[PDB]
PDB file of C-alpha atoms and ligand atoms in Angstrom:
ATOM      1  CA  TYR O   1     -26.951 -71.726  33.493  1.00 37.37           C
ATOM      2  CA  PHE O   2     -25.720 -71.360  37.084  1.00 36.90           C
ATOM      3  CA  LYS O   3     -28.723 -70.991  39.391  1.00 33.90           C
ATOM      4  CA  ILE O   4     -28.349 -69.415  42.838  1.00 35.44           C
ATOM      5  CA  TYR O   5     -30.978 -69.408  45.591  1.00 39.44           C
ATOM      6  CA  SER O   6     -31.027 -67.426  48.823  1.00 38.90           C
ATOM      7  CA  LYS O   7     -33.362 -66.941  51.792  1.00 39.10           C
ATOM      8  CA  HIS O   8     -32.127 -64.874  54.738  1.00 36.26           C
ATOM      9  CA  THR O   9     -33.946 -65.670  57.993  1.00 34.89           C
ATOM     10  CA  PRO O  10     -33.002 -64.374  61.463  1.00 36.83           C
ATOM     11  CA  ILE O  11     -32.192 -66.974  64.115  1.00 36.61           C
ATOM     12  CA  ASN O  12     -30.601 -67.142  67.575  1.00 40.11           C
ATOM     13  CA  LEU O  13     -28.650 -70.323  68.348  1.00 39.91           C
ATOM     14  CA  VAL O  14     -25.071 -71.374  69.058  1.00 37.76           C
ATOM     15  CA  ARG O  15     -24.990 -74.721  67.241  1.00 38.51           C
ATOM     16  CA  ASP O  16     -27.370 -77.557  66.298  1.00 41.56           C
ATOM     17  CA  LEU O  17     -28.981 -75.760  63.330  1.00 40.31           C
ATOM     18  CA  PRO O  18     -32.695 -75.423  64.115  1.00 41.07           C
ATOM     19  CA  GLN O  19     -35.605 -77.110  62.385  1.00 41.00           C
ATOM     20  CA  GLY O  20     -38.028 -75.255  60.147  1.00 42.45           C
ATOM     21  CA  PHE O  21     -39.308 -75.070  56.582  1.00 42.85           C
ATOM     22  CA  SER O  22     -37.570 -72.540  54.333  1.00 40.58           C
ATOM     23  CA  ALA O  23     -38.295 -71.425  50.764  1.00 40.43           C
ATOM     24  CA  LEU O  24     -35.183 -70.203  48.943  1.00 42.13           C
ATOM     25  CA  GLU O  25     -36.119 -67.796  46.155  1.00 41.97           C
ATOM     26  CA  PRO O  26     -34.111 -67.644  42.907  1.00 40.33           C
ATOM     27  CA  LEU O  27     -31.425 -64.957  42.840  1.00 41.95           C
ATOM     28  CA  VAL O  28     -29.437 -65.151  39.579  1.00 39.34           C
ATOM     29  CA  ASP O  29     -29.165 -67.302  36.438  1.00 36.51           C
ATOM     30  CA  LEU O  30     -25.614 -66.504  35.289  1.00 36.71           C
ATOM     31  CA  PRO O  31     -25.201 -67.970  31.766  1.00 38.08           C
ATOM     32  CA  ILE O  32     -21.836 -69.717  32.130  1.00 38.10           C
ATOM     33  CA  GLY O  33     -20.428 -72.655  30.195  1.00 39.34           C
ATOM     34  CA  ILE O  34     -17.911 -74.306  32.511  1.00 36.63           C
ATOM     35  CA  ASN O  35     -17.977 -77.875  33.850  1.00 35.14           C
ATOM     36  CA  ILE O  36     -18.287 -77.307  37.596  1.00 35.43           C
ATOM     37  CA  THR O  37     -17.122 -80.409  39.475  1.00 34.97           C
ATOM     38  CA  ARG O  38     -15.285 -79.081  42.565  1.00 36.90           C
ATOM     39  CA  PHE O  39     -15.801 -76.081  44.835  1.00 39.15           C
ATOM     40  CA  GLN O  40     -14.123 -74.496  47.851  1.00 38.31           C
ATOM     41  CA  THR O  41     -15.632 -72.046  50.323  1.00 38.71           C
ATOM     42  CA  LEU O  42     -13.797 -68.918  51.459  1.00 41.52           C
ATOM     43  CA  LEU O  43     -13.761 -67.079  54.779  1.00 44.60           C
ATOM     44  CA  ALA O  44     -12.112 -64.077  56.453  1.00 43.81           C
ATOM     45  CA  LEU O  45      -9.439 -64.137  59.154  1.00 44.58           C
ATOM     46  CA  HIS O  46      -8.709 -61.403  61.727  1.00 43.26           C
ATOM     47  CA  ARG O  47      -5.350 -59.612  61.871  1.00 44.94           C
ATOM     48  CA  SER O  48      -4.827 -57.319  64.856  1.00 43.48           C
ATOM     49  CA  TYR O  49      -2.234 -56.093  67.337  1.00 43.53           C
TER      50      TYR O  49
ATOM     51  CA  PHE C   1      -1.158 -41.174   2.116  1.00 41.87           C
ATOM     52  CA  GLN C   2      -2.213 -37.605   1.334  1.00 41.32           C
ATOM     53  CA  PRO C   3      -5.753 -36.178   1.416  1.00 42.16           C
ATOM     54  CA  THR C   4      -5.726 -35.928  -2.407  1.00 40.46           C
ATOM     55  CA  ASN C   5      -4.525 -39.116  -4.105  1.00 37.07           C
ATOM     56  CA  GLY C   6      -5.816 -41.986  -6.224  1.00 34.08           C
ATOM     57  CA  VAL C   7      -8.601 -44.418  -5.441  1.00 36.04           C
ATOM     58  CA  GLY C   8      -6.338 -47.095  -3.964  1.00 33.28           C
ATOM     59  CA  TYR C   9      -4.963 -44.796  -1.268  1.00 30.85           C
ATOM     60  CA  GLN C  10      -7.990 -43.603   0.739  1.00 31.03           C
ATOM     61  CA  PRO C  11      -8.480 -44.851   4.317  1.00 29.18           C
ATOM     62  CA  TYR C  12     -11.252 -47.317   5.116  1.00 32.17           C
ATOM     63  CA  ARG C  13     -12.531 -47.989   8.633  1.00 28.30           C
ATOM     64  CA  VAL C  14     -13.089 -51.740   8.218  1.00 29.29           C
ATOM     65  CA  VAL C  15     -14.791 -53.642  11.048  1.00 31.77           C
ATOM     66  CA  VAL C  16     -15.009 -57.420  10.610  1.00 32.27           C
ATOM     67  CA  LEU C  17     -17.777 -58.821  12.802  1.00 32.46           C
ATOM     68  CA  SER C  18     -17.552 -62.561  13.505  1.00 33.59           C
ATOM     69  CA  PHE C  19     -20.781 -64.234  14.629  1.00 32.26           C
ATOM     70  CA  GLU C  20     -19.793 -67.502  16.318  1.00 32.62           C
ATOM     71  CA  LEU C  21     -21.865 -69.942  18.378  1.00 32.99           C
ATOM     72  CA  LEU C  22     -20.582 -72.400  20.992  1.00 29.94           C
ATOM     73  CA  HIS C  23     -22.046 -74.932  23.413  1.00 28.91           C
ATOM     74  CA  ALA C  24     -22.370 -72.212  26.059  1.00 28.83           C
ATOM     75  CA  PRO C  25     -25.780 -70.516  26.413  1.00 25.15           C
ATOM     76  CA  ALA C  26     -26.081 -67.799  23.787  1.00 25.96           C
ATOM     77  CA  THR C  27     -26.161 -64.240  25.149  1.00 25.06           C
ATOM     78  CA  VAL C  28     -25.634 -61.969  22.115  1.00 24.47           C
ATOM     79  CA  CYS C  29     -29.154 -61.850  20.657  1.00 25.66           C
ATOM     80  CA  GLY C  30     -31.329 -59.368  18.797  1.00 27.53           C
ATOM     81  CA  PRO C  31     -33.980 -56.888  19.908  1.00 27.46           C
ATOM     82  CA  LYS C  32     -37.539 -58.112  20.415  1.00 27.83           C
ATOM     83  CA  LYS C  33     -40.357 -55.817  19.321  1.00 27.22           C
ATOM     84  CA  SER C  34     -43.283 -55.025  21.614  1.00 27.36           C
ATOM     85  CA  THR C  35     -46.836 -54.264  20.500  1.00 24.27           C
ATOM     86  CA  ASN C  36     -49.676 -52.586  22.411  1.00 21.00           C
ATOM     87  CA  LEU C  37     -51.389 -54.437  25.263  1.00 18.96           C
ATOM     88  CA  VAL C  38     -55.041 -54.581  24.191  1.00 24.83           C
ATOM     89  CA  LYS C  39     -57.476 -55.708  26.887  1.00 26.04           C
ATOM     90  CA  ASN C  40     -61.066 -56.984  26.970  1.00 24.03           C
ATOM     91  CA  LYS C  41     -60.943 -58.474  23.475  1.00 22.46           C
ATOM     92  CA  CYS C  42     -60.482 -61.975  22.054  1.00 20.73           C
ATOM     93  CA  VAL C  43     -56.984 -61.555  20.597  1.00 21.55           C
ATOM     94  CA  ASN C  44     -53.671 -63.417  20.517  1.00 24.12           C
ATOM     95  CA  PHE C  45     -50.809 -62.915  22.965  1.00 22.09           C
ATOM     96  CA  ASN C  46     -47.126 -63.779  22.468  1.00 22.20           C
ATOM     97  CA  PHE C  47     -45.200 -63.409  25.728  1.00 21.58           C
ATOM     98  CA  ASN C  48     -41.654 -64.593  26.462  1.00 17.13           C
ATOM     99  CA  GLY C  49     -42.779 -68.211  26.766  1.00 13.95           C
TER     100      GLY C  49
HETATM  101  C1  LIG F 101     -18.823 -80.131  29.825  1.00 15.18           C
HETATM  102  O1  LIG F 101     -17.714 -80.000  28.920  1.00 15.18           O
HETATM  103  C2  LIG F 101     -18.052 -80.257  27.548  1.00 15.18           C
HETATM  104  C3  LIG F 101     -16.767 -80.166  26.759  1.00 15.18           C
HETATM  105  O2  LIG F 101     -17.018 -79.908  25.384  1.00 15.18           O
HETATM  106  C4  LIG F 101     -19.111 -79.264  27.080  1.00 15.18           C
HETATM  107  O3  LIG F 101     -19.488 -79.575  25.744  1.00 15.18           O
HETATM  108  C5  LIG F 101     -20.330 -79.325  27.992  1.00 15.18           C
HETATM  109  O4  LIG F 101     -21.263 -78.315  27.626  1.00 15.18           O
HETATM  110  C6  LIG F 101     -19.916 -79.132  29.448  1.00 15.18           C
HETATM  111  N1  LIG F 101     -21.067 -79.262  30.328  1.00 15.18           N
HETATM  112  C7  LIG F 101     -21.424 -78.319  31.207  1.00 15.18           C
HETATM  113  C8  LIG F 101     -22.638 -78.620  32.034  1.00 15.18           C
HETATM  114  O5  LIG F 101     -20.796 -77.272  31.329  1.00 15.18           O
END
């Protein structure tokens, strides 16, 4: 089972991620059967004129 | 084959189900019955867990 947690909290800072206690609630329990050993995050670029 | 022929010439919609289990978490399960929720009485309860 692949567990995913999430807790969206508003903040206002540039860098130096602030301090504070957070409680991430469970989101999904996808029943998969793969051997996860490596991951890679994805982002979005900006194409314009 | 024609509509009127022998016994060994009639169509047969054959579906061969194959129940197979792997190391992955099982998802294809069966229905679970539900009784009536009796309150204010010394009875037994059988929830999910
Ligand atoms: C890792 O791979 C093996 C290969 O058979 C499998 O049996 C096992 O369930 C896998 N483990 C996880 C956590 O996916």
